Amino acid sequence: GRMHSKGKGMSSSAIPYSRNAPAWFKGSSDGVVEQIIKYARKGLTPSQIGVLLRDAHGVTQAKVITGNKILRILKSNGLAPEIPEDLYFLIKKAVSVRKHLERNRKDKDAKFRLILIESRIHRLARYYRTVSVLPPNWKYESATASALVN
């Protein structure tokens, strides 16, 4: 029922019956794979990619048409970034609150949230470290996190 707030939504994508393709929506596995790896070199993330693939072009899922997911495509071509997609988007937000707090000493409910986002990261990092994506004995935080971003 959400991680942090007390709001219990099911804002959700459904996923249709067919693991198989919706045949008529054409293209190819390789053509879509080449389509993807352009966007992986343009800097766009799996989540952005798959929106672009879906919205304009005829893809439903890369999972469907290619067999591989997307990150799994990108990894196979060496275009997945060091710091994972999701974590990176939190590490960005962290910085964008740590920055806002440095200016605003007196601002409590942002300090509150910053303590959330920080914690959310250490949930995800601690996940990723145990997967063996990020190397362990490596903490993803605040001072050096600004450098990890840029």
Q: Which residues make up the interface to RNA (CB under 7 A)?
A: 1-16, 19, 22, 45-51, 53-54, 60-63, 68-72, 75-76, 84-86, 89-90, 93, 96-97, 100, 103-113, 115-117, 119-120, 122-124, 126-127, 130-131
**Cα–Cα distance between 25 and 35 in angstroms, integer?**
15
Nearer CB in complex with Mg ion: 2/26: 2
- Our finding on whether 15 is near other proteins (CB under 8 A) is yes
Q: Are 145 and 93 in contact (CB under 8 A)?
A: no
**Cα–Cα distance between 67 and 108 in angstroms, integer?**
48
Which amino acid does the sequence have at 129? R
- Our finding on whether 18 is near other proteins (CB under 8 A) is yes
**Cα–Cα distance between 31 and 42 in angstroms, integer?**
17
Q: Which pair of tokens denotes residue 132?
A: 């063996």
Quote the least distance from Cβ 14 to other proteins, whole Å. 10
**Cα–Cα distance between 108 and 117 in angstroms, integer?**
14
- Our finding on whether 17 is near other proteins (CB under 8 A) is yes
DSSP letter (8 states) at residue 41: H
DSSP letter (8 states) at residue 56: T
- Our finding on whether 115 is near other proteins (CB under 8 A) is no
Quote the least distance from Cβ 65 to other proteins, whole Å. 17
Decide which of other proteins, RNA, Mg ion, none touches 124; Cβ closer than 5 to 8 Å per partner kind: RNA
- Our finding on whether 19 is near other proteins (CB under 8 A) is yes
